[PDB]
């Protein structure tokens, strides 16, 4: 039971493609889904081993009923919108997800071209984001991003679907959200004030202790224990993007999870707040402009089509 | 006389910023100009030595007259539109060029942000391009790009203004064009046909021999010799850019010379053709959508 | 759980293939070297980690196995079989032992080779010695990316490693080697599109030709075999270009591993003898086999207990 | 059960930190143990992938009883002095071990500063050693060091506690000894004589054939078989260190095994000898000045405090 | 065209600083080493190329010059001039010989250090041994980027190497070393804004503060000196973090190279004595000098020819 | 003003030496190649930048120079002088053109050598072809670090490049080639100390032996030469291991550049003929020269105007 490259080595370029399937285009999409792995190799092999090109393919809830006629994954539903008192997490269209990652952008682009070449006439692009990491694993806010991601075996258990849905083991659920930042408001804050928003030191990336960590900080609200006192983790690979001329500076959120319920819980706590926290302070500097949910099947599920 | 980093080592990433100066923004621009060099140091230093972060700052003909007074660079003028029978080389506004290049896209972005943060309210963005190179130094047409660029002392003599304009020694002229490719039409040709368009082999990057190479191939037309039989040369740093969603696949042309004469002859010879050739066949798969000319002064000129 | 030899090696840029016959009397010398080869590998390799990626796969032939070991024989161990095709011939040349030596540098290969041969002076006669170099973009002598469609991960393990079919020799594998000599003059007279029709993949971009344009007699068409069930049968290749410019000798060293030699043997049959659909493999019109040998490569454990 | 980073990729720098816990500093220490992995991530994450930063936390027999009640690991005991006819392996105080590794020494120091930062006023430092490895993987004596360390699965089985002590599976036993070399004496030997001392060729690092190898060579005396007939292996990460001014040229021995018996048996043969060998010839040029034993638990054990 | 020592090193990440005093009788031994020092560098360095970047700069003190060499003395060679500031002292401490060893890794420094000190045993007494390490993003012990404003290329050469104005010692340089111990506790007590105003640069972005926003008792302000004509007097520095986490030692090792010592000295006067506008350099409230020494580092030609 | 060939190449770990004689009537083809040798260098090399470090040094023999160009001859150009010593012999062998191809990868060397020879077939005859690799620690086949005392920077330019003494040929160099075969068996019967006394340096640490212990017939002793003015005379070497374990060939490929071949020949004489205090060079008791040629390597622009 072989998963896709969900658990990728640290990459520094990425392309996010989000497309909707035009009416009639179902067959063309199916043809591509079976070749996506072959196209990964076709492009990636001659740059190996330093390219680390990998494409993760996601399918939406509505798209699934169009493409496959059999069983559905148990967790697959449309992205749930969140009307918070102050902050709103929108749901935007998107039937397919192409999460492409590499050491260099051209490998991402090359593969992105191939995929879209096939899909021409069959799909409509909704979003396309060229991401780049800030050489010290920092995001647009200037804080280190991905410190707390699970690794090794914790990663496998947190992300890959298992025996709880045996027909779809090796799969994962992906949530994507495009955030825009108000760098103006943000850089108008003191470095200590920023630390209260995130819940970690800016330079040293040391976590604030519980004596000091405010309850409405990002790390406070995304820290979640389950019904059995153990931590619920997601796998994130946030990527900066933007455009100096247009004044756009963004974080592209993408979180993988064994079940959508984990990442949905965190999302609620951020947007709807909790007992002590009205919302995640990060949201006063971050507007989500997109929001979608995808199932990323096992690699052989895609292979065993055409 | 210290030049800007016009002779950069090979970089895999780049940003091209073109801006106009808003009316009454001249003073803000002058302050920035005497700082570029030190922002370059600030941003790029802690990513050394692998960073290779360099910005090159250009000034358009009109912007020069608003910014400075007195003697002007001999060959500084706005880009000369070319109206050929088939193809056109368009001129588009642009007062300042920022040619930012690093081994990493994020160093470019960090430096662009600083520069732009200090020009805010004083300039209008005209063009912004985020450029990457293919792993094998190929462009969007799949051919190796930059092989016949000059190196070392040959480049220095070809790009740097010297004694023919002593007041502006250490400077250079940069011509920029944004080109979009009709990839669909390109891939319609066979390899051999495509080779007769460029004038070099695709795979091996070997120049076609003279008794094969069309008079209308790109390499045939952009090879110009002067009256003493010397090769007239420029320094190119073509970067591919694109958006897969919008089917936009382009090459961002930038050429550096000691005088626009050189670049401009090549341009004429490409768009308007010669006695043998109607036009450069590469233009049959490439539309120029921007065109601008800048003077890239000596570094010590900016630090005043 | 038996530890196999480094059959599944990371990509390496350099290789030395060394093929010897055991001189009469030399048995016990060989028997001593076989048990020390794992050690020698580490000796030469360790001080150059992790860039070195030095490994040595040691293979034993059918007739030499009877000279060396009392006991059971690997199920599929036999002398390489000549194939007398209408047009093309696959010759069988003598070989008792294989040393497939792979590193990122020719020198690490040469130092291990020097050490192995140093221990075997006067026990063996050299049949073949090839210093191979991969091109920077993973391309072969014909200018095509070579290795694209190799199995990776669990696919590679299940494809190459012997298991329950022969429990005694679990973790073993089978190597078929062939030295090919190319007619580069003829090859370069073909157009790229013609060369594409010979291989079955696009030259520049290394995309498989689509099932509907792929000629029946292309390399890729004839080397794709399906199993009883319809599981595409797989081998693990590590072709290496080798050459002498002054002798005008442009070559590809073929080595392929499988769990059973019959998979490889099927493919050779189809290449050399042809099918109803294909006269023979078009790659043979530009390639001549000048050697052919077959070896079983036992698990590391097997070599250590001698 | 997720274990500690005992099986590290090769690193070129390391810091070894040995402390004892003062009276009443138990709680300060317990708070650290539960944060230590998150400190490792905090300092190490942004240096990835080059960084290869990691820290292994060991606890001694003494400190275990102060810090935890309940079950003790099966093999955890104080380091035992060996008083050979000639050579002495000393025992020296040490309750906590920090084995900190990276490609760069700054990362090590960064992490160590964090750890001790939290421990200020609770622990007394017994030893601090900044290690570096030579570029061709040679040690202070000039020989490639670490050639025959097990890798992959062999390493897993030799190093990690399993079914035999199931409440501590994923834990490990680390033995530590600070050696100071007599370089003058050593450099007086010819290459050939030095090889006779070690057991392997100096330049090529090829092992000497059993036909030739002395029985009091280092390789001879540290080669151990079991009743199973299987080789008994440990994992080492010996590190050069010193100061040219004080003429201190050393090797810092750290060895990991799934049980202390293996390490102790190797020590026994080196210091007390066999029938064939009076002692390990390496000791004629090497003096142990520290000696401590630690149990390095599974990570999730430290996390669950 | 005399060849200078490797005063202008590529960026190096490790360093050993050696300061020794020459014992009674040690002249002959020292003179021997000085004549062999450049070839010892090559003996240790060459087999580590090109990653090694191992180099050693050798310096001779004022009192030492006269014990070693009859004849001309470098123009600005004199003992370190102590500065007894109203508040802060810049101490002088003994030193006849300096060995500034830099490489990409520490082991390479140590090996050279062992070789040098080996030849010198009995002839010298060590005063100071510092093993230095730069942080991965060129930060010092105070968490600020350190090196940004160093000159490079033709600027550095003009700034550092002796020329026409002292023709016999053209290609030499003047090195000043001081060991600084930090009160990290005081420092880490300040806000990032506070710290930024002590240095005069932004902490994360390393952007210089604007001239009228930058305090006059700031470090950048006080060490910015214009000479006769309103051009910047430059020096070349390679400060190395060092320390010990047990003894709570956290230090900068300052070393500065100049064409003439007057430059470094003017900068020191301004730091310790102050100006009209400023009492003393604010960095000095977090930093205590514990050593102070001046050396002339001659051209390699000079050392070679004795 | 005059631009040389890449004589002063950085460190490369792979090389190909190609020696060819020019057939009767082949002169025209040869001249055409010479004018394009730079194009082909950029054609093979550019796509592999920056890592490839591909370079080609073309040299021409004395007898070949006469056939190829009328006009003045490099002052120092002449056929290699046979040295018929009492024990050892430095044989002269035919060679009209030398292609010294260096890169960080052998495959890049092969690709350029293919291009050069492709244009040359039917006009030249191969005399020698050697594929060189350097050990990871810069060691030669004798196990000694090789190249330690080679000059660098300015010093290397003074020693290598023809200057104003031959103004027409300013920027050229003289290259001497000798292919040596070693008696490894004999060499390995010596203790390290005995070997050390042959070379004149310590094996492991590569420290030059002190003048007290270093024999007068050691390799370093005999290849150290002072000119009539007391300055060391230097050559630039790039010795490359080569060989074949099958045929017991263990070699050193010797190439030495000098601004005048007189420097090199001085060294060859001392090696082969000896001095008062030395019968011959002890290295020769373990090394046999099988080839011997001398070529002039012109300025790059000399070849461009053909
Ligand atoms: C559509 C955008 C363009 C593309 C994709 C392109 C691509 C190429 C390629 C593949 C080559 C051959 C390899 C090499 O770089 O040496 C080349 C050569 C060259 N191009 Fe272009 N080019 C473009 C536009 C231009 C323009 C506008 C100019 C001048 C105004 C120019 C000047 C040159 C020159 C001077 C050469 C080298 C001539 C020689 O081989 O001696 N290019 N270009
Ligand atoms: C003359 C020497 C040979 C050359 C130059 C050569 C070259 C290639 C190339 C370029 C490919 C396509 C890229 C790839 O998938 O790796 C390929 C695929 C392959 N070759 Fe060969 N090959 C040679 C001999 C052989 C032989 C003798 C066999 C079998 C006995 C073989 C079996 C295969 C297989 C199984 C594939 C993959 C087929 C697939 O796409 O599923 N090759 N080879
Ligand atoms: C004085 C400090 C020490 C030094 C410098 C040292 C050095 C070496 C060297 C050079 C080797 C050969 C290369 C290798 O396989 O790693 C080696 C092997 C080994 N050493 Fe040591 N060693 C030291 C202390 C110890 C101690 C105290 C032990 C036992 C507790 C030990 C156990 C081993 C083992 C087990 C091997 C591998 C044996 C085998 O070949 O299977 N070492 N050591
Ligand atoms: C306590 C030890 C010291 C530390 C930690 C330190 C740190 C720094 C830092 C962070 C900078 C700004 C970034 C840079 O340009 O490198 C700097 C700049 C500088 N420091 Fe220091 N420094 C120290 C001592 C000294 C001393 C003793 C001198 C002079 C004798 C000196 C001269 C300079 C100069 C000249 C600059 C650059 C001036 C400019 O901005 O144009 N430093 N130092
Ligand atoms: C049999 C082939 C040869 C081998 C294996 C060899 C090896 C070496 C070695 C190991 C060194 C010392 C390390 C170094 O400085 O590079 C050396 C130095 C040198 N060799 Fe050779 N060599 C050979 C042939 C030659 C020949 C034929 C010449 C002269 C024609 C020569 C000239 C030199 C010179 C000038 C030095 C440096 C001497 C100095 O320290 O100033 N070598 N060689």
Question: SS3 letters for chain C?
Answer: CCCCCCCCCCCCCEEEEEEEEECCCCHHHHHHHHCCHHHHHHHHHHCCCCCCCCEEEEEECHHHHHHHCCCCCCCCCCCCCCEECCCCEECCCCCCEEEEEEECCHHHHHHHHHHHHHHCCCCEEEEEEEEEECCCCCECCCCCECCCCCCCCHHHHHHHCCCCCCHHHCCCEEEEEEEEEECHHHHHHCCHHHHHHHHCECCCCCCECCCCCCCCCCHHHHCCEECCCCCEECCEECCEEEEECCCCEEEEEEEEEECCHHHHHHHHHHHHCCCCCCCCCHHHHCEEECCCEEEEECCHHHHHCC
Q: Which ligand is nearest to the CA of C179?
A: 2
Between vectors from CA A104 to CA A103 and to CA A107, what angle results, nearest 5°? 110
E199 interfacial to chain D (CB closer than 8 Å) = no
Query: What's the CA gap between D128 and D118, in Å, rounded?
Result: 17
Selecting from E51, E129, E250 the residue whose C-beta is nearest the C-beta of D243 gives E129
- For F179, residues 6+ apart whose C-beta sits below 8 A from its C-beta are F17, F128, F130, F251, F253, F254, F289, F290, F291
DSSP-assigned beta bridge partners for residue B239: B252
Please count the residues of chain F.
306
Query: What's the CA gap between C236 and C228, in Å, rounded?
Result: 20
Residue C113 preceded by cis peptide, ω within 30: no
Query: What's the CA gap between D160 and D75, in Å, rounded?
Result: 13
Show the ligand 2 pocket: residues with CB < 6 angstroms.
C 140, 142, 144-149, 178, 180, 199, 201, 219-220, 223-224, 235, 237, 239, 252, 254, 256, 264, 267-268, 283, 287
Give the torsion sign (CA, D283, D287, D292, D296).
negative
Neighbours of E189 (CB within 10 A): 11
- The DSSP H or E segment spanning B63 is helix B61-67
Neighbours of B129 (CB within 10 A): 18
Q: Return the residue in B139, B205, B209, B211 with the most chain F beta carbons within 10 A, the one to mutate for interface testing.
A: B205
> Where do the H-state alpha helices sit in E4-119?
27-45, 62-68, 106-119
From the candidates A95, A139, A145, A216, give the one annotated as an active-site residue: A145
Give, in order, the Cα–Cα distances in Å from C230 to each of A299, C257, E292, F93: 18, 20, 80, 63
* C-alpha R_g of chain A: 19
Burial (CB count within 10 angstroms: exposed 0-12, middle 13-18, buried 19+), residue D224:
middle
Query: What's the CA gap between E100 and E240, in Å, rounded?
Result: 11
E strand intervals along A133-238: 172-181, 235-236
Q: How far does the CA of residue B282 sit from the closest CA of chain A (Å)?
A: 21
Neighbours of D73 (CB within 10 A): 21
B136 interfacial to chain C (CB closer than 8 Å) = yes
Residue F29 preceded by cis peptide, ω within 30: no
Burial (CB count within 10 angstroms: exposed 0-12, middle 13-18, buried 19+), residue E119:
middle
- How far away, in angstroms, is D232 Cα from ligand 3 center? 13
Query: What's the CA gap between E173 and B58, in Å, rounded?
Result: 38
Selecting from E13, E52, E246 the residue whose C-beta is nearest the C-beta of D104 gives E13
Give, in order, the Cα–Cα distances in Å from E65 to each of A230, B2, E121, E146, E174: 70, 38, 20, 32, 13
Q: CB-hemisphere CA count at 13 Å for C144?
A: 28
Query: What's the CA gap between A1 and D239, in Å, rounded?
Result: 42
Measured over all CA atoms, what is the biggest interatomic distance in chain E, rounded to whole angstroms?
Answer: 57
- For F142, residues 6+ apart whose C-beta sits below 8 A from its C-beta are F182, F187, F195, F199, F252, F283, F286
Distance of CA B116 to the CA centre of its chain: 20
Residue B214 preceded by cis peptide, ω within 30: no
> Where do the H-state alpha helices sit in chain A?
26-33, 36-44, 61-67, 105-119, 152-159, 183-187, 191-198, 218-221, 260-271, 299-303
Give, in order, the Cα–Cα distances in Å from D141 to each of D191, D215, D238: 11, 20, 11
- For B291, residues 6+ apart whose C-beta sits below 8 A from its C-beta are B79, B81, B89, B90, B91, B92, B175, B176, B177
Q: Report the candidate in B265, B292, B284 with the shortest Cα–Cα distance to residue B197.
A: B284
**Structure tokens that stand for C110 in this block:** 């040469």
Place of tokens 């290259």: F175
- The DSSP H or E segment spanning D109 is helix D105-119
Question: Residue A143 — φ and ψ, nearest 5°?
Answer: -100, 150
Selecting from A106, A130, A134 the residue whose C-beta is nearest the C-beta of B130 gives A130
Distance of CA F222 to the CA centre of its chain: 18
Contact A136, A144 (CB under 8 A): yes
Please count the residues of chain E.
306
Listed by the residue before each break, gaps in chain D with C–N over 2.5 Å are: none
Q: How many cross-chain Cβ pairs, B to C, lie less than 8 Å apart?
A: 18
Residue C291 preceded by cis peptide, ω within 30: no
Contact B146, F46 (CB under 8 A): yes
Query: What's the CA gap between E239 and B227, in Å, rounded?
Result: 55
Neighbours of F51 (CB within 10 A): 11
Q: Report the candidate in F61, F63, F18 with the shortest Cα–Cα distance to residue F37.
A: F18
Burial D229-267 (b: 16+ CB within 10 A, else e): eeebbbbbbbbbbbbbbebebbbbbbbbbbbbebbbbbb
Atom of ligand 3 nearest to the CA of D199: 12
Terminal CA-to-CA distance of chain D, rounded, Å? 15
Q: Return the residue in E246, E249, E252, E253 with the most chain D beta carbons within 10 A, the one to mutate for interface testing.
A: E246
Query: What's the CA gap between E138 and B48, in Å, rounded?
Result: 9
Collapsed DSSP state (helix, strand, coil) of residue F160 = helix
Q: Give the strand pairing for F249-258 and F240-244.
A: antiparallel
Neighbours of A212 (CB within 10 A): 11
Q: Report the candidate in C47, C53, C69, C67 with the shortest Cα–Cα distance to residue C10.
A: C53
Query: What's the CA gap between D258 and D230, in Å, rounded?
Result: 15
Contact F34, F116 (CB under 8 A): no
Query: What's the CA gap between F178 and F81, in Å, rounded?
Result: 12
Residue of F nearest to C13 (CA): F105
- How far away, in angstroms, is E88 Cα from ligand 4 center? 17
Q: Give the strand pairing for B235-236 and B248-257.
A: antiparallel
Q: Give the strand pairing for C14-22 and A13-21.
A: unpaired
Residue of E nearest to D127 (CA): E246
Query: What's the CA gap between B126 and B135, in Å, rounded?
Result: 29
- The DSSP H or E segment spanning D67 is helix D61-67
Place of tokens 């991003």: A145
Neighbours of B213 (CB within 10 A): 19
- Helix-strand-coil percent breakdown of chain F, rounded to 5? 30, 25, 45
Q: How far does the CA of residue F137 sit from the closest CA of chain D (Å)?
A: 8
- Name chain D contacts of E106, Cβ cutoff 8 Å: 13, 105, 132
> Are C246 and F13 inside 8 Å of each other by CB?
no
Query: What's the CA gap between D129 and A98, in Å, rounded?
Result: 49
Q: Which ligand is nearest to the CA of C177?
A: 2
> Are F3 and B147 inside 8 Å of each other by CB?
no
Question: Residue B197 — φ and ψ, nearest 5°?
Answer: -85, -45
Q: Report the candidate in B83, B102, B143 with the shortest Cα–Cα distance to residue B11.
A: B102
Query: What's the CA gap between C234 and C227, in Å, rounded?
Result: 10
Show the ligand 3 pocket: residues with CB < 6 angstroms.
D 139, 141, 143-148, 177, 179, 198, 200, 218-219, 222-223, 234, 236, 238, 251, 253, 255, 263, 266-267, 282, 286
Contact C160, C61 (CB under 8 A): no
Query: What's the CA gap between E155 and E152, in Å, rounded?
Result: 6
**Structure tokens that stand for C33 in this block:** 């070297």
- For F305, residues 6+ apart whose C-beta sits below 8 A from its C-beta are F35
Query: By alpha-carbon position, which residue is closest to atom 4 of ligand 1?
Result: B251
Give, in order, the Cα–Cα distances in Å from E121 to each of C204, E21, E35, E98, E115: 64, 12, 16, 15, 10
Query: What's the CA gap between E92 and E290, in Å, rounded?
Result: 8
The number of helix segments (H) and strand segments (E) in chain B equals 10, 14
**Structure tokens that stand for E298 in this block:** 């001659």
Contact D200, D219 (CB under 8 A): yes
Chain F: touching chains (3 or more CB pairs < 8 Å): B, C, D, E
Give the torsion sign (CA, E47, E50, E54, E56).
positive
For the annotated catalytic residues of E, the residue numbers are 146
Query: What's the CA gap between D170 and D296, in Å, rounded?
Result: 9
Distance of CA D15 to the CA centre of its chain: 12
Q: Report the candidate in D285, D149, D284 with the shortest Cα–Cα distance to residue D222.
A: D149
Query: By alpha-carbon position, which residue is closest to atom 9 of ligand 2?
Result: C146
Q: Report the candidate in F178, F292, F181, F286 with the shortest Cα–Cα distance to residue F244.
A: F181
Contact A297, A168 (CB under 8 A): yes
- Name chain A contacts of E191, Cβ cutoff 8 Å: 190-192
Query: What's the CA gap between A184 and A186, in Å, rounded?
Result: 5
F213 interfacial to chain D (CB closer than 8 Å) = no
Query: What's the CA gap between A222 and E298, in Å, rounded?
Result: 61
- For E285, residues 6+ apart whose C-beta sits below 8 A from its C-beta are E186, E198
For the annotated catalytic residues of B, the residue numbers are 145
SS3 per-residue string spanning D23-48? CCCHHHHHHHHCCHHHHHHHHHHHHC
Distance of CA E137 to the CA centre of its chain: 20
Query: What's the CA gap between F120 and A89, in Å, rounded?
Result: 70
Contact B213, B220 (CB under 8 A): yes
Question: Residue F193 — φ and ψ, nearest 5°?
Answer: -65, -45
- Name chain A contacts of B240, Cβ cutoff 8 Å: 106
């Amino acid at each position: 039971p072989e998963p896709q490259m969900v658990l990728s080595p640290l990459t520094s370029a990425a392309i996010f493609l989000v497309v909707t399937i035009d009416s009639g285009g179902e067959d063309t999409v199916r043809d591509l889904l079976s070749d996506v792995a072959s196209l990964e190799r076709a492009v990636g092999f001659r740059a190996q081993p330093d390219g680390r090109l990998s494409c993760v393919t996601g399918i939406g809830s509505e798209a699934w009923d169009r493409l496959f006629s059999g069983a559905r994954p148990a967790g697959l539903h449309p992205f749930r919108e969140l009307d918070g008192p102050v902050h709103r997490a929108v749901a935007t269209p998107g039937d397919l997800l192409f999460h492409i990652r590499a050491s260099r952008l051209d490998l991402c682009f090359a593969l992105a071209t191939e995929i879209m070449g096939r899909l021409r006439g069959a799909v409509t692009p909704q979003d396309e984001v060229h991401g780049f990491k800030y050489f010290d694993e920092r995001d647009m806010l200037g804080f280190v991003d991905g410190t707390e991601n699970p690794t090794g075996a914790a990663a496998r258990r947190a992300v890959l679907v298992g025996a709880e849905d045996p027909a779809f083991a090796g799969g994962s659920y992906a949530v994507v959200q495009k955030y825009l930042h108000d760098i103006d408001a943000w850089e108008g804050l003191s470095v200590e004030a920023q630390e209260r928003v995130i819940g970690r030191r800016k330079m040293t990336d040391v976590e604030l202790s519980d004596d000091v960590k405010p309850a409405d900080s990002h790390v406070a609200l995304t820290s979640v224990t389950g019904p059995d006192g153990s931590d619920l983790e997601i796998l994130r690979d946030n990527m900066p993007f933007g455009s100096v001329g247009r004044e756009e500076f963004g974080t592209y959120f993408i979180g993988y999870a064994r079940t959508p319920e984990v990442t949905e819980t965190m999302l609620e706590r951020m947007f709807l707040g909790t007992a002590s926290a009205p919302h995640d302070r990060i949201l006063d500097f971050s507007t989500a402009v997109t929001g979608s949910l995808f199932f990323t099947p096992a690699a052989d599920f895609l292979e065993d089509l055409s």
